[PDB]
Write a protein that binds this ligand. Structure first.
Ligand SMILES: *[C@@H]1O[C@H](CO)[C@@H](O[C@@H]2O[C@H](CO)[C@@H](O[C@@H]3O[C@H](CO[C@H]4O[C@H](CO)[C@@H](O)[C@H](O)[C@@H]4O)[C@@H](O)[C@H](O[C@H]4O[C@H](CO)[C@@H](O)[C@H](O)[C@@H]4O)[C@@H]3O)[C@H](O)[C@H]2NC(C)=O)[C@H](O)[C@H]1NC(C)=O
Ligand SMILES: C[C@@H](CN1CCC(Cc2ccccc2)CC1)[C@@H](O)c1ccc(O)cc1
Ligand SMILES: *[C@@H]1O[C@H](CO)[C@@H](O)[C@H](O)[C@H]1NC(C)=O
Ligand SMILES: *[C@H]1O[C@H](CO)[C@@H](O)[C@H](O)[C@H]1NC(C)=O
Ligand SMILES: *[C@H]1O[C@H](CO)[C@@H](O)[C@H](O)[C@H]1NC(C)=O
Ligand code: NA
Lengths: 356, 355
């Protein structure tokens, strides 16, 4: 059995111990844990380009401890230029990324924008909250988000009522109070908000100054806004609901475990059906030259992988197929309390009457 | 001693670097520079996009550039929009016309001194008003750029209406299917949006079906009558050329002009922080960036070499000027210009197809 190099870049304080603690296929994984200090573009591109020359890495498992969705993007880039598979299993690396390259081989753990927004509607149904408005920025996915909502509302014999839908511009500043004006026009109990963590801190800070954080106002937001739960910006309204990847039930070493699983299994499958597995790029400083000699024939497999009795399959747009979701509620002590679980397409809530 | 602000640029050749360097020098000359003074910081394109991104970081962002100008090479401006977009440093497109960059959702801090291809619709439109074509067929490639132009024209149509829009899979060679579907309709004005290689494909099929004859009007863009696309283009076709749209030098001079004015307008305000020096370790957007985009994005430079500089909501050039072209006896012949707002028909008569 031959050995494929699988690099595991764990960013920020992490226990290499349990990580290294946690596979009889047709090929064996030669794993190598690497830590990384920084997460700007030059750091991440460089760390990975270097590692790829030192060894022959056929895969990458990326985990970080931040709320930087731009890490997901930096990775997708890196992934597509070098044609190396990359798994963003935890962190910024794992945030919703909409419209990844065609040539990419970048997959993320966690639910797609389309799915979260579905989850957000099942909730609103449980509690017969049928009247609501949407607010998004221009963040990628915003269109998938609004459109997923709409085709649900449109195709439903339930009494939905989408009251308004605001698109806010954060490309420009707000020394003119343009946003404020828009927000002041909302008049609904529920408000689905799609944007980013740092975007939302600012939006709420403004939404407060128009009395929209109070009671009578409930805000639901997706995973990338909740971000990392041990960090709650002071301007997040208490009472805020949000979906979230169950970092509780399903923690890091378990993720790095399936990390190495998918890349190994998928490699096996391709040495089997084809008697070969694509050679890892020797260097990024040479991508124009060596391009006709590379492809994404491994995606066929990186997607459809069964392991330890679980379908760890991915979708087309590169997000996990059926992940376990927790629904969390920002409480009075400003800590995030679990209040529901999402399993198949079934949602189970803790409360029958919603908390204050 | 004044504060030195750096502008950076990623340009085609060392001759153009020198032009940029000199454009800034003249801005420094033209302006009051007791408090702030510009410095020019440039590189040329890199072989692939990773090496490019990095070059941005090491060469430009390492010098705290407030802006980055970007042309083409002799490999797109995307790795540059991203790296720089990561911090909200404004990137100014000197020559790219693709419609991707008009999308604030992925190219947020991007503006250009040239309009995207899809904006040719504004001209095709004044053109339908002029020659009273009220019924048109629109044929576009089903790529981003294709849809961009379809989206753009339908906006202006809601006068003259669009009878059918026929979208086709890019890279296809036998369009006889699509074309015959268009032949059946009463309308005989046809508007095409497609690359060179897909222009060619349409143009042929269009001929073997006798639709490039007389009684047909073919209205197109610049891509559809450039290089390879001309080798099989039917006579009587009308098409456009973005005047100066490929003079890197003309556009360097004008971009630097606008940018130097914005930089000065900006420092009239307060709480202006410098961009982050270097990439390594910095992961916060430049705080002043979104303001500086706002200041650029609503700049106005009126006596500019490329004409009248002014940007729409998406950061795209407005009042761009087009040559109106007629393929006559297999020569591209100028029959007029679109001057930003008006069509101006010159002495050379238009020979339609058939004629
Ligand atoms: C692209 O092409 C367009 C069209 O030619 C140019 O636009 C016109 O530009 C001219 C010259 O600047 C403008 O002219 C002045 O018009 C005034 C009155 O305007 C009205 O009536 C016309 C006709 O219907 C309308 O188009 C227009 O909307 C107004 O309702 C006059 O009072 C002016 O006169 C005074 O100044 C002139 C010199 O400019 C002197 O000769 C006179 O003695 C007097 O002191 C003058 O004639 C015209 O208004 C513009 N029309 C429109 C609709 O835009 C653009 O300049 C050109 N663009 C570029 C980028 O080159
Ligand atoms: C999505 C971002 C753009 N984004 C930031 C990260 C950057 C990642 C990257 C950098 C260098 C090399 C490769 C990849 C690429 C560009 C921006 O348009 C935006 C921000 C906020 C918003 O409401 C809408 C849009
Ligand atoms: C990265 O930073 C940590 C904490 O300061 C340090 O332990 C480590 O040595 C650094 N890495 C390098 C480049 O040595
Ligand atoms: C992937 O492999 C599984 C299990 O071997 C099999 O059911 C199927 O053929 C593949 N799945 C897809 C997406 O076709
Ligand atoms: C365009 O470049 C500059 C514009 O300032 C000018 O000196 C030159 O003559 C022009 N050249 C062309 C290609 O027309
Ligand atoms: Na833009």
């Amino acid at each position: 059995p031959p050995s494929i190099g699988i690099a595991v870049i764990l960013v920020g304080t992490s226990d290499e111990v349990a990580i290294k603690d946690a596979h009889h296929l047709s090929v064996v994984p030669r794993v190598e844990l690497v830590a990384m200090n920084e997460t700007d573009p030059k750091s991440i591109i460089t760390r990975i380009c270097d590692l790829m020359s030192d060894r022959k890495i056929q895969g990458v498992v990326f985990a970080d401890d931040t709320d930087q969705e731009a890490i997901a993007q930096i990775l997708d880039f890196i992934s597509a230029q070098t044609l190396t598979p990359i798994l963003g299993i935890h962190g910024g690396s794992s945030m919703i990324m909409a419209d990844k390259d065609e040539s990419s081989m970048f997959f993320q753990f966690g639910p797609s924008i389309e799915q979260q927004a579905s989850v957000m509607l099942n909730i609103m149904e449980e509690y017969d909250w049928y009247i609501f408005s949407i607010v998004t920025t221009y963040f990628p996915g915003y269109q998938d988000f609004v459109n997923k909502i709409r085709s649900t509302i449109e195709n439903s014999f339930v009494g939905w009522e989408l009251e308004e839908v605001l698109l806010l511009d954060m490309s420009l500043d707000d020394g003119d109070s343009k946003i404020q004006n828009q927000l002041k026009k909302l008049q609904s109990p529920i408000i689905l908000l799609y944007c980013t963590k740092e975007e939302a801190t600012y939006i709420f800070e403004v939404a407060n100054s128009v009395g929209l954080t109070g009671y009578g106002y409930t805000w639901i937001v997706p995973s990338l806004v909740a971000g990392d739960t041990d960090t709650v910006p002071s301007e997040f309204p208490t009472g805020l609901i949000s979906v979230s990847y169950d970092e509780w039930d399903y923690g890091l070493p378990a993720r790095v475990r399936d990390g190495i699983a998918i890349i190994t299994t998928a490699a096996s499958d391709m040495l089997s059906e084809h008697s070969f597995i694509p050679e890892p790029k020797s260097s990024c400083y040479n991508t124009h030259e060596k391009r006709i000699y590379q492809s994404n024939m491994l995606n066929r497999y990186l997607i459809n992988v069964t392991f330890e009795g679980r379908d760890l399959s991915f979708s087309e747009d590169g997000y996990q197929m059926h992940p376990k979701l927790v629904i969390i509620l920002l409480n009075k002590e400003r800590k995030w309390e679990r209040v529901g679980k999402w399993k198949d397409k079934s949602l189970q809530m803790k409360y029958y009457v919603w908390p204050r | 001693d004044p504060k030195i602000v750096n502008i950076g640029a990623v340009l085609s050749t060392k001759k153009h670097e020198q032009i940029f360097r000199e454009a800034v020098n003249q801005a420094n000359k033209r302006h009051f520079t007791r408090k702030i003074q510009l410095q020019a910081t440039s590189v040329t394109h890199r072989p692939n996009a990773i090496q490019m991104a990095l070059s941005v970081c090491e060469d430009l962002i390492s010098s705290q550039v407030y802006a980055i100008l970007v042309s083409h090479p002799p490999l797109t401006p995307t790795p540059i929009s991203y790296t720089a977009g990561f911090y909200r440093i404004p990137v100014i497109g000197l020559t790219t016309r693709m419609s991707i960059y008009s999308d604030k959702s992925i190219h947020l801090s991007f503006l250009r001194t040239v309009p995207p291809y899809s904006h040719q619709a504004l001209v095709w439109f004044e053109m339908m008003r002029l020659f009273n074509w009220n019924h048109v067929i629109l044929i576009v490639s089903d790529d981003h750029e294709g849809r961009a132009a379809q989206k753009k024209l339908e906006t202006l149509l809601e006068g003259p209406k669009a009878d059918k829009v026929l979208q086709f899979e890019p890279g296809t060679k036998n369009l006889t299917a699509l074309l015959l579907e268009a032949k059946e309709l009463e309308a005989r004005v046809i508007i095409l949006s497609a690359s060179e290689d897909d222009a060619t494909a349409v143009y042929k099929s269009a001929a073997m079906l006798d639709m490039t004859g007389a009684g047909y009007v073919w209205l197109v863009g610049e891509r559809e009558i450039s290089g390879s696309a001309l080798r099989y283009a039917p006579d009587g076709i009308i098409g456009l050329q973005l005047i100066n749209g490929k003079n890197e030098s003309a556009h360097i001079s004008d971009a630097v002009a606008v940018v130097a004015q914005a930089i000065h307008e900006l420092f009239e305000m307060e709480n202006i922080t410098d961009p982050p020096r270097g990439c390594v370790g910095n992961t916060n957007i430049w705080k002043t960036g979104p303001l500086f985009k706002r200041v650029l994005m609503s700049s106005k430079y009126p006596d500019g070499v490329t004409g009248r500089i002014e940007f729409n909501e998406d950061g795209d050039r407005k009042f761009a000027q087009y040559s109106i072209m007629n393929l006559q006896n297999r020569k591209l012949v100028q029959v007029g210009i679109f001057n930003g707002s008006y069509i101006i028909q010159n002495d050379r008569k238009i020979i339609w197809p058939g004629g």
